[PDB]
């Protein structure tokens, strides 16, 4: 509406655009690592609810699609283990969960696509290795789109700013001219 | 066909098997159940000069100490190190 208001929004959406881009780049590297680790994890995999996701949002419909234990801080806050997702999952993570004790996880397909004794720890591990590959791809995807949406909003807001900037000057001048005439 | 993998590495996509129980595989495995192992390694990477140090350290905590099932964890570590 007013130049000061747009000024603050513009600085805000400019920062977001940059952060979303950097977050896309971190997730791209995290996915690159995860997809490499998923290869030997699948061949190993071949041979109560409770719900598998992570602590971190900004990954689209990863948490919502999978949503009394739940691995991931998002699972319990929406509906217990914390500190998952940030560091790639290990078999030790699966053991911790199994020791504290269907299985609901996001299965990796591609960068865009994903779908919802000792072998007990194997199944938890399988779900973990698939989940993070899906989560890192989905975050990379969502942040790419967010950074694009931020870009288009920066342009739209900059145009509104400049039309308002010009209109303010023109209006002030017309009031001055009218008073003088 | 025969499949042999750890959660991180694939080795194969007669097999001598220790029963799992820490020991040598001839086509070193830690444990597990296609042969599935929590840690499967060479054989080139293992030392072995430090496993003796690990065995003696585990036998030091055994003469602790004391409280049951602590203890049982120490003995398992002694069994893995002896192999």
């Amino acid at each position: 509406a007013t130049l000061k208001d747009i000024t603050r929004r513009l600085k805000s959406i400019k920062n977001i655009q940059k952060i979303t881009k950097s977050m896309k780049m971190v997730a791209a590297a995290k996915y690159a690592r995860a997809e490499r680790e998923l290869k030997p994890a699948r061949v190993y995999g071949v041979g109560l609810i409770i719900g598998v996701s992570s602590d971190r949002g900004l990954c689209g419909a990863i948490h919502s699609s999978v949503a009394i234990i739940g691995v991931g801080d998002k699972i319990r806050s929406i509906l217990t283990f914390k500190e998952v997702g940030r560091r790639p999952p290990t078999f030790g993570d699966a053991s911790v969960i199994a020791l504290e004790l269907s299985i609901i996880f996001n299965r990796f397909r591609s960068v865009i696509s994903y779908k919802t004794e000792y072998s007990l720890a194997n199944i938890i591990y399988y779900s973990l290795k698939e989940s993070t590959t899906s989560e890192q791809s989905a975050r990379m995807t969502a942040m790419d789109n967010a950074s694009k949406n931020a870009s288009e909003m920066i342009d739209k807001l900059t145009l509104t700013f400049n039309r308002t900037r010009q209109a303010v000057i023109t209006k002030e001048l017309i009031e001055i001219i009218s008073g003088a005439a | 066909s025969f499949t042999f993998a750890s959660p991180t590495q694939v080795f194969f996509n007669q097999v001598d098997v220790p029963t799992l129980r820490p020991g040598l595989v001839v086509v070193f495995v830690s444990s597990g159940s296609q042969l599935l192992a929590e840690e499967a390694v060479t054989l080139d990477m293992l030392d072995l000069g430090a496993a003796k140090a690990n065995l003696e350290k585990a036998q030091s905590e055994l003469l602790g100490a004391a409280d049951e099932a602590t203890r049982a964890e120490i003995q398992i570590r002694i069994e893995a190190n002896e192999a």
Partner: peptide, 25 residues
């Protein structure tokens, strides 16, 4: 019955200890 399975314990803890002992060597 195995000694570790008396007061406790699971085979998951067994494997967890054995796997770590391999890494530490």
């Amino acid at each position: 019955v195995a000694y570790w399975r008396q007061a406790g314990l699971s085979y998951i803890r067994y494997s967890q200890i054995c796997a770590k002992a391999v890494r530490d060597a």
